């Protein structure tokens, strides 16, 4: 009998405890692993994949649920009009929940790193124009005009020539990691607001549709990192599984 003292924590079951348990099957060798393509070895690999961002999360009925994946762009009065706004927080409850970056961010408390938001123009080849996609760092509210918005981190997107630009949301925060921003005290961890403005217009000739659509694809860069794995709250079930 080796002398031994039991500390606090015996006979407890920590669900995330990494321990050695008794094997049920002695000398059981598993089925050999054949090579399966596409193996994932880190969730940040999934976070780096561009995934459709639901900027136009206005419709709710199932008939128009497909309209959430794209937001309209059309000819305007040429006064620097606002096209679309959304918060740049991947873990926030909103546009980013449709993204794999948003869904995987739901399973982690803290995130850090820059974000790729690719805006792809899905109008005609004869549809020309420019958009100012402005990312406002935290502190600046929703810009009233394009002049307010261009003071932040912004890109100018010729969608007449280049059908898809990426707006890199740079990692600009006080903290090294960001918790998930919420409507309250945790808005301290806001990434900011990303707003798309008509830099010139949406110009088409006769025969081309007057309204086009932009598909926002959201992702994260190589410097992205999630921390402190937690239960997700993007989707919740009040009923059991039959």
């Amino acid at each position: 009998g080796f002398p031994t003292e039991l500390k606090p924590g015996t006979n407890q079951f920590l669900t995330t405890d990494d321990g050695v348990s008794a094997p049920i099957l002695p000398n059981f060798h598993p089925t050999p692993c054949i090579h399966i393509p596409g193996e994932v070895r880190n969730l940040l690999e999934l976070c780096q994949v561009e995934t459709i961002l639901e900027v136009n999360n206005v419709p709710t009925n199932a008939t128009s649920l497909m309209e959430r994946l794209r937001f309209p762009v059309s000819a305007q009065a040429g006064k620097g009009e606002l096209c679309a706004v959304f918060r740049a927080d991947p873990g926030r409850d909103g546009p980013w929940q449709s993204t794999m970056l948003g869904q995987l961010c739901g399973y982690y408390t803290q995130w850090s790193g820059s974000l790729e938001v690719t805006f792809m123009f899905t109008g005609s080849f004869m549809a020309t124009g420019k958009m100012l996609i402005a990312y406002t760092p935290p502190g600046g509210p929703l810009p009233k005009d394009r002049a307010t918005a261009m003071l932040g981190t912004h890109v100018i997107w010729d969608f007449g020539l280049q059908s898809s630009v990426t707006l890199v949301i740079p990692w600009i925060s006080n903290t090294h990691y960001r918790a998930h921003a919420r409507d309250g005290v945790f808005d301290y961890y806001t990434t900011g607001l990303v707003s798309i403005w008509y830099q010139t217009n949406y110009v088409v000739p006769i025969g081309a549709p007057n309204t086009a659509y932009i598909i926002a694809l959201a992702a994260a860069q190589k410097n992205f990192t999630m921390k402190l794995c937690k239960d997700t709250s993007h989707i919740l079930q009040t009923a059991s599984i039959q």
């Binding site: 606090p8 924590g9 079951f13 918790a179 961890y189 806001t190």
Partner: protein, 249 residues
């Protein structure tokens, strides 16, 4: 093109005549890893049978160690404070009885769903760190890392978390650094029906690998509210005892 881009024979020497003293006096007990690695009561959770506090057999205790004066004054000697914590939960009846009841401690980090009931689906703890332990078992001890998004925990946050105008309705947000609120510590009685024992879960927390930075004045007033330096203004007491006169003791 710009070029601008141990006493020996104020160290006791300048005041008195001194002898040589071999000071074999260790300073190892005044370190942070000695002064702070002592478990103190930071949380008490009541799970009564008829009371209105937590009558459904579950409780969501927001992690806030400023609820008890001893450890709060200990850690509030500094502002910035980075450590790993040894969290111990001593569950017992309010009469002190050790009853054969099984509990589920669950760490619920911010963003994870706080359980709305005893039989909530958040108790499946597929990603949340959770402890299953009986009261007949010794108190559940878990090692909690330094989980803050900041480089240190911050018992005093001179500022506001959000932007915008800060009215009197948003004045409660002052001093609430979300680098310190780390979700809730959720306790349940594991079962569909109500537990037959009134239960008290006492949280004892010991900080290891402690690093603390900025020493402030201690707390010489009575604590009133958690994460709040508020003091009783009409009953401000001195830092120590008083004297009838200064020429006497």
């Amino acid at each position: 093109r710009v070029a601008d881009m141990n006493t020996q024979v104020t160290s006791d020497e300048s005041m008195i005549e001194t002898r040589c003293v071999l000071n074999s006096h260790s300073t190892a007990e005044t370190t942070l890893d000695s002064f702070f690695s002592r478990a103190g009561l930071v949380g008490e959770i009541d799970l009564p049978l008829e009371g209105t506090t937590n009558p459904n057999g579950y409780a969501n205790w927001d992690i806030d160690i400023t609820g008890y004066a001893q450890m709060r004054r200990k850690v509030e000697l500094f502002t910035y404070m980075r450590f790993d914590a040894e969290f111990t939960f001593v569950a017992c009846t309010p009469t002190g009885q050790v009853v054969p009841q099984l509990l589920q401690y669950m760490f619920v980090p911010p963003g994870a769903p706080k359980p709305e009931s005893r039989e909530s689906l958040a108790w499946q703890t597929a990603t949340n760190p959770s402890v299953f332990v009986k009261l007949t078992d010794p108190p559940a001890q878990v090692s909690v890392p330094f989980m803050s998004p900041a480089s240190a925990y911050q018992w005093f946050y001179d500022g506001y978390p959000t932007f915008g105008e800060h009215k009197q309705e948003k004045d409660l947000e002052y001093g609430a650094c979300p680098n310190n609120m780390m979700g809730t510590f959720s306790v349940r009685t594991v079962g569909s029906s109500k537990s037959k024992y009134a239960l008290v879960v006492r949280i004892y927390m010991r900080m290891k690998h402690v690093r603390a930075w900025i020493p402030r004045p201690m707390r010489n007033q009575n604590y009133l509210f958690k994460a709040n330096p508020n003091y009783a203004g009409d009953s401000i007491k001195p830092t120590g005892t008083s004297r009838n006169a200064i020429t006497t003791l």
